[PDB]
Amino acid sequence: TAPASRRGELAVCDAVSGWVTDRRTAVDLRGREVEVLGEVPAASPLRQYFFETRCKADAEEGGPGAGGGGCRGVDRRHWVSECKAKQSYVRALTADAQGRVGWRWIRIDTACVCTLLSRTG
């Protein structure tokens, strides 16, 4: 391990990115549950998958910078923080409850962010 100092800019919250090839359902920009088709239009087929980013998963409370606990670098004298997933929209070939197919804006995890709650004096 190399000292946090010998490396560069640190994240207040640790994240993990990776491809998601098995998301079968999502929530669109209207709050409705939708089915995510396995294949998207052509540019032959082409499997539809996504690039998602979540907070580093972590059961033994305590350590700073872990999803579900405090964030790294926050002033505990005045704030209570928590690392949370942040979602955004990406357009996806989907099917609604009526089965109608079409591109729709669905939410996915694209980042892990820090949130605050004052406690100051």
Window 60-79: residues binding another protein (CB under 8 A): none
CB of 105 to another protein, least distance (A): 8
Identity of the residue, 45 or 62, whose beta carbon is nearer to a second copy in the bound complex? 45
Largest CA distance in the chain: 63
CB of 38 to another protein, least distance (A): 12
**Interface with another protein, residue 47, by CB under 8 A:** yes
Spatial distance between the Cα atoms of 52 and 71, rounded to a whole number of angstroms? 21
Residue type, 29: L
> Which range of residues in 20-28, 55-63, 76-84 is near a second copy by CB under 8 A?
76-84
Spatial distance between the Cα atoms of 40 and 45, rounded to a whole number of angstroms? 7
Among 35, 58, 96, 107, binds another protein (CB under 8 A): 107
> Which range of residues in 14-22, 34-42, 96-104 is near another protein by CB under 8 A?
14-22
Angle at 108 between CA 86 and CA 59, to 5 degrees: 60
Among 42, 45, 98, 99, binds a second copy (CB under 8 A): 42
- C-alpha gyration radius of the chain: 19
